[PDB]
Write a protein that binds this ligand. Structure first.
Ligand SMILES: [Zn+2]
Ligand SMILES: [Zn+2]
Ligand SMILES: [Zn+2]
Ligand SMILES: [Zn+2]
Length: 108
DNA sequence: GTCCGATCAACTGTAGTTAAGCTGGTAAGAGCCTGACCGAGTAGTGTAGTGGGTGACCATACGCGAAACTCAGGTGCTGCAATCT
């Protein structure tokens, strides 16, 4: 919506941003080499609250997305969708007019 | 590079060693396809992290209108005085 009208000034940086706090998040993270959210359970650190929140689940068994078929736990919707698509007849015969459909790619 | 000509055997006259397949009953080469076993191949997958854009909520800005507040307009009598009598 609103136009990108805050330009990073550093040598060899191309980026422009919508609102000045975001330009500052970029500058402190990329160019100065500082981060604002530390893991309690390992050495790593993160640039956003949502990124530390994802990393915190990785230290735990009670992972926040749970499979509808097998009940395996995962941390975000992309992982869930890819995993659940393995519980489907995903693959299709690529050859002309052939009707068949398959569950594991080596079968196809 | 070439020159001479000696010299192993090239290409030339006849005297004596090699298969192919018959009768068979037979084990011998060379072989075929299903099956099993591990290495490698095809390639989509499993967590995990960087970035971005959407959405909500805010406040900041002007500009028009709404009510506020200040300061001075306006009403009407009559205490006192002056024109007409
Ligand atoms: Zn930059
Ligand atoms: Zn950690
Ligand atoms: Zn599952
Ligand atoms: Zn087919």
């Amino acid at each position: 919506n609103r136009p990108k009208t805050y330009f990073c000034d550093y040598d060899g940086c191309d980026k422009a941003f919508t609102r000045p706090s975001i330009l500052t998040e970029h500058q402190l993270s990329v160019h100065q080499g500082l981060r604002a959210f530390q893991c309690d359970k390992c050495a790593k650190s993160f640039v956003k609250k949502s990124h530390l929140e994802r990393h915190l689940y990785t230290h735990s068994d009670t992972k926040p997305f749970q499979c509808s078929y097998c009940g395996k736990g995962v941390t975000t919707r992309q992982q869930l969708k890819r995993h659940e698509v393995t519980h489907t007849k995903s693959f299709i015969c690529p050859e002309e007019g052939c009707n068949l459909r398959f569950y594991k790619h080596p079968q196809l």
